[PDB]
Design an enzyme around this catalytic site. Structure first.
Site, PDB file in Angstrom:
ATOM      1  N   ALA D  38       6.915  -3.474   2.211  1.00  0.00           N
ATOM      2  CA  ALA D  38       5.948  -4.235   3.029  1.00  0.00           C
ATOM      3  C   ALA D  38       6.477  -5.605   3.434  1.00  0.00           C
ATOM      4  CB  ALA D  38       4.670  -4.392   2.267  1.00  0.00           C
ATOM      5  N   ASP D  39       6.338  -5.952   4.714  1.00  0.00           N
ATOM      6  CA  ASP D  39       6.719  -7.292   5.209  1.00  0.00           C
ATOM      7  C   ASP D  39       5.443  -7.919   5.755  1.00  0.00           C
ATOM      8  OD1 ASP D  39       6.716  -7.143   8.419  1.00  0.00           O
ATOM      9  OD2 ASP D  39       7.644  -5.278   7.698  1.00  0.00           O
ATOM     10  N   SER D  40       5.288  -9.236   5.687  1.00  0.00           N
ATOM     11  CA  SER D  40       4.015  -9.893   6.081  1.00  0.00           C
ATOM     12  C   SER D  40       3.248  -9.105   7.132  1.00  0.00           C
ATOM     13  CB  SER D  40       4.295 -11.271   6.583  1.00  0.00           C
ATOM     14  OG  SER D  40       5.527 -11.257   7.338  1.00  0.00           O
ATOM     15  N   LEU D  41       3.782  -8.971   8.338  1.00  0.00           N
ATOM     16  CA  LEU D  41       2.985  -8.345   9.423  1.00  0.00           C
ATOM     17  C   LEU D  41       2.466  -6.989   8.974  1.00  0.00           C
ATOM     18  CD1 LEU D  41       3.776  -8.561  13.209  1.00  0.00           C
ATOM     19  CD2 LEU D  41       1.742  -9.137  11.930  1.00  0.00           C
ATOM     20  N   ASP D  42       2.798  -6.512   7.788  1.00  0.00           N
ATOM     21  CA  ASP D  42       2.253  -5.179   7.451  1.00  0.00           C
ATOM     22  C   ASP D  42       1.446  -5.282   6.167  1.00  0.00           C
ATOM     23  OD1 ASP D  42       3.558  -3.256   5.315  1.00  0.00           O
ATOM     24  OD2 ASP D  42       5.330  -4.133   6.276  1.00  0.00           O
TER      25      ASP D  42
END
Ligand SMILES: CCCCCCCCCCCCCCCCCC(=O)OC[C@H](CO[C@@H]1O[C@H](CO[C@H]2O[C@H](CO)[C@H](O)[C@H](O)[C@H]2O)[C@H](O)[C@H](O)[C@H]1O)OC(=O)CCCCCCCCCCCCCCCCC
Ligand SMILES: CCCCCCCCCCCCCCCCCC(=O)OC[C@H](CO[C@@H]1O[C@H](CO)[C@H](O)[C@H](O)[C@H]1O)OC(=O)CCCCCCCCCCCCCCCCC
Ligand SMILES: CCCCCCCCCCCCCCCC(=O)OC[C@H](CO[C@@H]1O[C@H](CS(=O)(=O)O)[C@@H](O)[C@H](O)[C@H]1O)OC(=O)CCCCCCCCCCCCCCC
Lengths: 49, 50, 127, 85
Positions: D38-42
């Site tokens: 997971a990366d911020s935008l997700d």
């Protein structure tokens, strides 16, 4: 609530008739107020039946 | 060979017989679709929300 | 049982809205109303999808703006602001002031207070 | 006022797996989001999918500090519990 939403949607004239038993603890009050009759008349007046 | 030739003839005439009644069956299918919308549980939910 | 006495004011606007609503409820057959209900549902789903796309785009944009603001490292955004944007809890002025605060001082975690709900407008016997 | 936290946890994990694309055995109740890919935008789109599935609204202040699956589950359960009042 089910009875009210049924009566308002017109679907009441085609349901199967019901039997319901309302119990209320004994009435030995100084008053002659009875909340069974009052509740059912409120149901019949809110929906205009 | 002969019996399947008779079957081919009945198949072609079945094509014609199916197409000649196509407007009638079209209106029939449209009516079936119409009256199918109005006995779901979805329509009951709509009636109660209304 | 809980109606605020302000939804029961008799005014000149409401005795005409009565006719609009009575048409919709008694003068239109429930089948056409049902078809319109289905159509309106589909439309609202499309609109919600569009709005969600736009909100994610705004998140990248402001995460980019905070970089100019801080000049250096800061690249994150605020998830609080994303969720507040999705539930329509910001007035336009709050959005503008947040954008300015980001552009000038980074500071991605300083958020405008919150929007308060709009009260029902009343004039007089008129509406 | 009383929520079946077990059901909420199973549904959270299934939603997370379907969103990220990993399989349900890898999603552990203590797995953080950064390692599941997971990366911020997700970690936001996951929040939106959660709300969309459960039909609730998340409390934002606490939603800023969601980093493990158990916090997601507990946020959702504390939201569902405080529904009538
Ligand atoms: C095209 C499909 C039209 C098919 C049809 O038979 O179209 C005729 C329809 C009227 O259809 C009638 O529509 C009725 C709709 O009833 C449904 O809806 C009613 C309330 O609207 C009642 O609830 C009823 O119980 C429920 O079944 C029934 O389907 C009747 O059988 C059917 O004749 O008119 C219309 O298309 C609507 C008229 C708009 C013209 C402008
Ligand atoms: C355009 C129509 C303006 C309506 C937009 C409302 C936006 C709004 O709510 O902003 C948000 C704030 C209102 O702020 C609201 O105030 C409430 C208390 O009354 C509470 O504080 C609410 O929380 C807050 O949302 O708007 C402003 O502060 C005023 C904006 C004025 C904009 C009017 C523009 C029209 C002027 C044109 C006339 C030109 C003459 C020269
Ligand atoms: C001659 C007309 C002169 C009036 C000039 C118009 C003034 C400007 C518009 C008034 C502000 C609107 C108030 C409001 O939105 O109420 C809520 C109303 C319903 O009225 C409401 O409806 C309620 C009952 S219900 O919602 O319909 O069930 C009821 O509680 C409430 O009293 C009633 O007002 O909701 C509407 O959607 C009104 C939209 C119509 C706006 C077009 C205006 C035309 C110009």
């Amino acid at each position: 609530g089910s009875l009210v939403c049924q009566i308002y949607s017109g679907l009441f004239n085609k349901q199967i008739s019901k039997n319901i038993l309302l119990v209320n603890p004994k009435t030995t009050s100084n008053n002659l107020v009875d909340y069974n009759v009052l509740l059912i008349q409120a149901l019949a007046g809110e929906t205009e039946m | 060979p002969l019996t399947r030739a008779v079957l081919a003839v009945v198949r072609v005439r079945e094509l014609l017989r199916a197409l000649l009644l196509l407007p009638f069956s079209a209106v029939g299918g449209a009516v079936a679709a119409w009256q199918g919308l109005f006995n779901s549980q979805r329509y009951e939910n709509f009636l109660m929300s209304e | 049982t809980d109606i605020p006495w302000a939804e029961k004011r008799w005014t000149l606007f409401s005795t005409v809205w009565y006719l609009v609503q009575q048409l919709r409820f008694v003068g239109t057959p429930p089948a056409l109303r049902y078809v319109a209900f289905l159509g309106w549902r589909a439309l609202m789903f499309q609109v919600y999808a569009a709005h969600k796309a736009l909100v994610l785009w705004q998140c990248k944009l402001d995460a980019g703006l905070a970089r100019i603001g801080s000049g250096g490292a800061t690249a994150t955004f605020s998830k609080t602001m994303a969720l507040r944007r999705l539930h329509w809890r910001n007035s336009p002025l709050a959005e503008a002031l947040y954008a300015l605060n980001l552009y000038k001082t980074g500071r991605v975690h300083l958020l405008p207070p919150v929007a308060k709900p709009i009260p029902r407008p009343t004039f007089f016997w008129l509406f | 006022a009383a929520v079946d936290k077990a059901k909420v946890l199973e549904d959270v994990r299934s939603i997370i797996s379907t969103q990220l694309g990993t399989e349900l055995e890898k999603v552990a109740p203590e797995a953080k989001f950064v390692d599941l890919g997971a990366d911020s935008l997700d970690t936001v789109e996951i929040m939106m999918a959660l709300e969309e599935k459960f039909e609730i609204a998340l409390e934002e202040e606490g939603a800023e500090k969601i980093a493990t699956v158990q916090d997601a589950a507990d946020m959702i359960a504390a939201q569902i519990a405080a529904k009538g009042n």
